[PDB]
């Protein structure tokens, strides 16, 4: 697969049509469009099944470059859950001017800059995915 590909909606629909064709209830690949809690569970089950086919490197925060005061950051503006699909932030602020205490608190907490500024890690002691040191 392409390393930069994060939206596998078409593949999810292809698999659902392939194996669960006559399952009457509708299926939402992205749970942001679900109707209530019960539909969220119903679609998250199928996403749980279908997310074991896609590369593990495509799941995680969707980071994006933003400009402030002429200085570019690399900040998280979404997520790609194995269960809930793709979620996009609604209040992404591009070309901002100042960071208040709230914005400084938000940007200092996400793993975007911490992971992007660190060096690569390959830990042979564990099977769990390792991102950075």
């Amino acid at each position: 697969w392409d390393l930069l590909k994060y939206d596998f909606t078409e593949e999810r629909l292809k698999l659902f049509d392939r194996y669960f064709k006559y399952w009457d209830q509708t299926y939402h690949p992205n749970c942001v469009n679900c109707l209530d809690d019960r539909c969220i569970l119903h679609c998250a089950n199928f996403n749980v099944l279908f997310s074991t086919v896609f590369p593990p490197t495509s799941f995680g925060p969707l980071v994006r470059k933003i400009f402030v005061d002429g200085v570019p950051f690399v900040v998280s503006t979404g997520y790609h859950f194995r269960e809930l699909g793709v979620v996009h932030n609604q209040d992404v602020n591009l070309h901002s001017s100042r960071l208040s205490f709230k914005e400084l608190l938000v940007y200092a907490a996400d793993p975007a800059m911490h992971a992007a500024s660190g060096n690569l890690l390959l830990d042979k002691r564990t099977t769990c995915f390792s991102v950075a040191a």
């Binding site: 200085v71 800059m113 992007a116 500024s117």
Partner: protein, 49 residues
């Protein structure tokens, strides 16, 4: 009357002084932590390649 109208205001004045001492201390610590967070962001950005 007047001596019991006075020695009970020295307590509230002292309490006010301590409270606004505390609030000033908090407001200085806030500025310190703000500067620390901003400079940390700006120094970790410079390794970005």
């Amino acid at each position: 009357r007047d001596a019991a109208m006075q020695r009970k205001l020295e307590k509230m004045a002292d309490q006010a002084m301590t409270q606004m001492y505390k609030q000033a201390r908090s407001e200085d610590k806030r500025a310190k932590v703000t500067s620390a967070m901003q400079t940390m962001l700006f120094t970790m950005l410079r390794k970005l390649d």
